[PDB]
């Protein structure tokens, strides 16, 4: 009934509480589950749910022969409530693509479906299932979003888009979307800047979105702009790398990429900035996506320091993770005074790493919570290989 | 809550977006989904559904084994959302029958399936679910309708139903159904043409359809009428072909069927009017029905030249199409003031093309949109055969 | 919003329009379906459903060994929107019994279900999901009830059950029933009239029913009741008999049983009193349960005549068939001043008939419409055996 | 739209109605049902849910190997309506957990889920989805609630969570929940009770719940408190013990626990006070879990005999049992003036018992009813092993 207002700051956060584990790949062991990748969540007023870019095929099933590949005109973003296994029975369609954003701005949600040729695909903007507008690659080179939630402010919604090679420099620009409707962008000058894969949260009219290097970063750039969009951008100072692979901690920079050998690639991760600290998601592999855990420098925003100030384990390194989002929860679903930050992890099964014909993932999500919290390790679960 | 008016014109088109694809037959590999063919979209105001005439059975199994002929006490119309795999899960009864078509005057859904015995079948008209009127085969061969969507406009709603042989001359009526009740038709006078499957669309009070000759037409016959069903008809002015199988393009006739050896058979088709100039969905295949694109002849709906003006590929002619439909998008859901143009696509999969024991189709649809767009390939993507 | 009234007739039939085939067993030869028997529909304001006895179990299944048999800890009651496949996602739970009756009165669902020992059943009175009342065998040989949809009229609803043996003569007591309350009943006098399974309808204040004759009647026994439950009884005058096993049409009764060696047994069935006349739903053969038709002696309801007036051919004697129901359709969801009759009928697929070890059924259901209609054979279509 | 009300007393309760069987397991032979335990009903005005603790995957499946344990990071917490079989299909989530209680107050559920490691595990409250309140174990040994029903009254909600060891003494809590806000809570201070696993229920301002003594009490220990929390204990006066093991019925106790040897252990079971009197709902064996029958001493909840005053069978001891709730369905929904109390029965299937490498359970649930009832058995009915 009433839109999603601006001006609200990350509540307090101690310690992260479990929101929800799906164990999508363990039910797809004999059930009728899609193949999935790319998951991340997205709430609105009423209802939460969980999205994904479908493979166009179920688990254990000869169509799911090479599900390691991103991108096909197969691939069809879709959501279904969060904690179930997205099956062809709960899971509602949104759109065709192989890379995507959605997001609400309360009452509605916005769906950023990116389909079509490597060389010239299109963004097309849906507004609760409308298409409403779109968008065609720029510069010739997988365009693509997020891969995760977009953020949403007083009838207009926010995202980022890239467009260049993984190699090296590419190009961004942030949309400004209301009701579907692009209403206006702005193309980021960001010299020496991989930006891609942001996890985004709004935090008090401005909007902050930490994403990934998968150029020369081991640690994560980021980004934080206006209702009309003037930018500042950077890297998160804190010496606790968020990237993957990464090296060693070490000092860490505020401004740029900190190659090490291993900045070179990375994977999708987040972070929450609490004023001069922050709160950093990040694998406990350095050179694989295995383990999951949120840390917490204090100093972390600001300095370069590689001094942590506590560890949550969310997923012991003798399991696999992957793709790390970060969703946030508006005070319009909360009677609270503040956003409440939360986000998922998507546990990747199958190849390149595992010895199966398929690739899919599972998820996990927790929330803020100013209360008592525990770690551990909720893995996917599924006993591999298959009836491959 | 508000009934969808008149008086609205098929807003600009410069490229097709992708709405949605379903990979319908790629998830029934081990999926729990139905048999299918005949299916087209249809939205409501809030809702768009995808219709489709069932085998009254699911893929991949034995009760799929003749699924290639058209016709039975056992194919039944039913509804799902789009996007969404058609399966006993998610699919809604709609009527019984193996022929029909259904629309929304706004609020409400319309549903005319056709079953019973080929020598005398009878049309059922549900509104809402209830059956609301009848009409009986009046030339005792086949009566059939549109086998798409059908167009309302000011509580009233109105289609096309043919009756006669496949091999030469049929008879044709036009109905004007409100509420389900069959307030008038008229009989067409069409000498030498073979009216069926048309694919409709409102534009302006009136009602432009264009189907296709299974008779002697390797074009397109088309037909516009009134509130009060004065009809005008002719065929496509353009040497763009539209049916299938059909000739190399040659200078086209606009009142005739252009035979050439080809026109004596068809597939459905689809087509819009923009003025002079006039979209045309067509496969690429001149035999067989595989491959689809959209092509654009700005002196098309007029003229009987062979030059195009443009096309955006959608399935490449190395996977298998099908049926064309073509539904619309009102201006009560889209906050505009023209009503969006979209369609649909049928890949058709199994026989009497591939080795199978059965033969179903998936889909895919497009939609207007006046902003960017790519050419591609967005096929069933089935791997056939199946656990046969 | 509104509930049902009461005073109405039904609607002029002129033939019998297909409302709805489920192909519940052909689903279920590879899907997911309940092994089912006993089905029936009943529709409220704006929801059709399909409500059925459960063997608990599903379709081709080592747990539907046996499912021949009627009463069981497991059978259960469930519903499911029309048409639909009774599957364990889409039907609904209702309560748990291995005979029973629903009806709506409007804006809610009434339900009574009879569980419990052959010895000292009880029914269980549910309305809208809550258990409002229960009554428990006074015979003290299988309480049983319609095995149809009752009938509702101004708050109170009406049903009957049987207590007494198959063998002779049984006692049968009339319900009142007003939001699930038992607001009185009457205890039948039928001096050897064998009541059971009752076919009921409302007609003007009043309710009639035509049920079977279990004992000695190869016709059909009905039954006229009171908002006080005044009754008025006897058989259908009728020689064009009803029930099944039934011998060739004689000249028939309207006050006894008519035996000639096949009276003995029985099948549900229904009719529909039209002044004079009456609609006459029965099977093609006499002594199995294959086919299926509708008759029309317009003398027949007052008449002993043999002659009948038109056949509307619903189901070849080639195929099964089964129980034969008859809900109806009120004035308020049809904007019109007549209550619609309409009807089902159960085809039974599996044993003591087919060499199967389960036994199971599907349905298909018509309704008045003064219109056109044709005849045909809508059949079950399940390739027998299954994967036993 | 209206608060669950408090000041309500059970009402009067002659036998148990059959609410609903489910054949969980039994649907699960073939069917793509949920590996369950820990099962139980709870109802708000217009639905009841069949909440349970997910073993994370699907009966029939190898991911089912070893579901005979509780606890792991794969436990979750989900809910569906009665009768219907928990399946991926109709399980909506609920929390991450693997011992839980979740309650309405009315027009919202709350939701407790209790997940993490043995030694810190954490409760996680959840008001109608949204994280709200958490509560971490405080004396550091699987902090346990419920694992049935909470009950609320006048927008405040009750609970009861453990915290020892199983050996001997533990400890015990009494929450006060608001909108999933913990907005109080007292230590209850019994020396020499074992409690755990309360079966609970309103009664007037206060809240009765009758639990378990898995230490040295083959009787049942209480406790009644407060919108304040002022608490009252002891166990059941009656000599007809309810635990299970438990010795043959002797003259009980009502304050300590009474263990004969078998003590030692038990399982969950409730019972409800009327006045002097009581109904007790208790297993057949004394050993095993099995059968299931609801007792009547009317002196029962003061005094210590052993004669009781009549037994309602409901699963004759030559199947299995297992945990036994008791929920409540409150006036609001009933039109009436008295709670009606309610219970269902887990039937667990697989180990320690049978032999199989899975674990689940099913479900049956009976009301109060003022009327008429018969006994009998209304087992899972599953024919085991499976296809292992
Ligand atoms: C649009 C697209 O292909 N995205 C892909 C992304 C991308 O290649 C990289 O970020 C360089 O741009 O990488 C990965 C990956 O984790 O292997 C999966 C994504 O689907
Ligand atoms: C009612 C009916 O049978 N329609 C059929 C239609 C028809 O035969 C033709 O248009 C001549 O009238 O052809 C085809 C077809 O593409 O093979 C499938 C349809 O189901
Ligand atoms: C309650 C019950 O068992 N009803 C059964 C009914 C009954 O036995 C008969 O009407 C004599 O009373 O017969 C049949 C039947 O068609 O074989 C199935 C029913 O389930
Ligand atoms: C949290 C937890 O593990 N609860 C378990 C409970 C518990 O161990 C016992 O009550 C001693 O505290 O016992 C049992 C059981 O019937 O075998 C299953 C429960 O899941």
């Given at each position: 009934?009433?839109?999603y207002?601006?001006?609200?700051?990350?509540?307090?956060?101690?310690?992260?509480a479990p929101?929800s584990?799906?164990?999508?790949?363990?039910?797809?062991?004999?059930?009728?589950?899609?193949?999935?990748?790319?998951?991340?969540?997205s709430?609105?007023?009423?209802?939460?749910?969980?999205?994904?870019?479908?493979?166009?095929?179920?688990?254990?099933?000869?169509?799911?022969?090479?599900?390691?590949?991103?991108?096909?005109?197969?691939?069809?973003?879709?959501?279904?409530?969060?904690?179930?296994?997205?099956?062809?029975?709960?899971?509602?369609?949104?759109?065709?693509?192989?890379?995507?954003?959605?997001?609400?701005?309360?009452?509605?949600?916005?769906?950023?479906?990116?389909?079509?040729?490597?060389?010239?695909?299109?963004?097309?903007?849906?507004?609760?299932?409308?298409?409403?507008?779109?968008?065609?690659?720029?510069?010739?080179?997988?365009?693509?979003?997020?891969?995760?939630?977009?953020?949403?402010?007083?009838?207009?919604?926010?995202?980022?888009?890239?467009?260049?090679?993984?190699?090296?420099?590419?190009?961004?620009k942030?949309?400004?979307?209301?009701?579907?409707?692009?209403?206006?962008?702005?193309?980021?000058?960001?010299?020496?800047?991989?930006?891609?894969?942001?996890?985004?949260?709004?935090?008090?009219?401005?909007?902050?979105?930490?994403?990934?290097?998968?150029?020369?970063?081991?640690?994560?750039?980021?980004?934080?702009?206006?209702?009309?969009?003037?930018?500042?951008?950077?890297?998160?100072?804190?010496?606790?790398?968020?990237?993957?692979?990464?090296?060693?901690?070490?000092?860490?920079?505020?401004?740029?990429?900190?190659?090490?050998?291993?900045?070179?690639?990375?994977?999708?991760?987040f972070?929450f900035?609490?004023?001069?600290?922050?709160?950093?998601?990040?694998?406990?592999?350095?050179?694989?996506?295995?383990?999951?855990?949120?840390?917490?420098?204090?100093?972390?925003?600001?300095?370069?320091?590689?001094?942590?100030?506590?560890?949550?384990?969310?997923?012991?390194?003798?399991?696999?993770?992957?793709?790390?989002?970060?969703?946030?929860?508006?005070?319009?679903?909360?009677?609270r005074?503040?956003?409440?930050?939360?986000?998922?992890?998507?546990?990747?099964?199958?190849?390149?790493?595992?010895?199966?014909?398929?690739?899919?993932?599972?998820?996990?999500?927790?929330?803020?919570?100013?209360?008592?919290?525990?770690?551990?390790?909720?893995?996917?679960?599924?006993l591999?290989?298959?009836?491959?």
């Amino acid at each position: 009934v009433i839109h999603y207002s601006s001006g609200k700051d990350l509540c307090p956060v101690k310690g992260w509480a479990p929101l929800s584990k799906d164990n999508g790949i363990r039910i797809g062991s004999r059930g009728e589950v899609f193949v999935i990748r790319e998951p991340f969540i997205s709430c609105s007023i009423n209802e939460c749910r969980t999205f994904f870019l479908t493979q166009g095929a179920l688990l254990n099933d000869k169509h799911s022969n090479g599900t390691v590949k991103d991108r096909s005109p197969f691939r069809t973003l879709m959501s279904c409530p969060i904690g179930v296994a997205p099956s062809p029975s709960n899971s509602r369609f949104e759109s065709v693509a192989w890379s995507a954003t959605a997001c609400s701005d309360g009452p509605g949600w916005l769906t950023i479906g990116i389909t079509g040729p490597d060389a010239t695909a299109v963004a097309v903007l849906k507004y609760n299932g409308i298409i409403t507008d779109t968008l065609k690659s720029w510069k010739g080179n997988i365009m693509r979003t997020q891969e995760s939630e977009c953020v949403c402010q007083d009838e207009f919604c926010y995202t980022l888009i890239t467009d260049g090679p993984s190699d090296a420099q590419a190009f961004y620009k942030i949309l400004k979307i209301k009701k579907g409707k692009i209403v206006s962008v702005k193309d980021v000058d960001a010299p020496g800047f991989h930006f891609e894969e942001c996890s985004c949260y709004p935090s008090g009219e401005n909007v902050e979105c930490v994403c990934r290097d998968n150029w020369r970063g081991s640690n994560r750039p980021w980004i934080r702009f206006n209702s009309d969009l003037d930018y500042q951008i950077g890297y998160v100072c804190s010496g606790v790398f968020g990237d993957n692979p990464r090296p060693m901690d070490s000092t860490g920079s505020c401004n740029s990429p900190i190659n090490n050998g291993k900045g070179r690639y990375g994977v999708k991760g987040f972070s929450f900035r609490y004023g001069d600290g922050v709160w950093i998601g990040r694998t406990k592999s350095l050179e694989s996506r295995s383990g999951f855990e949120m840390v917490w420098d204090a100093n972390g925003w600001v300095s370069t320091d590689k001094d942590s100030n506590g560890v949550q384990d969310i997923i012991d390194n003798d399991n696999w993770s992957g793709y790390s989002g970060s969703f946030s929860i508006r005070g319009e679903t909360t009677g609270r005074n503040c956003t409440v930050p939360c986000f998922w992890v998507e546990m990747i099964r199958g190849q390149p790493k595992e010895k199966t014909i398929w690739t899919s993932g599972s998820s996990i999500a927790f929330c803020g919570v100013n209360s008592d919290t525990t770690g551990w390790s909720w893995p996917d679960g599924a006993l591999l290989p298959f009836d491959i």
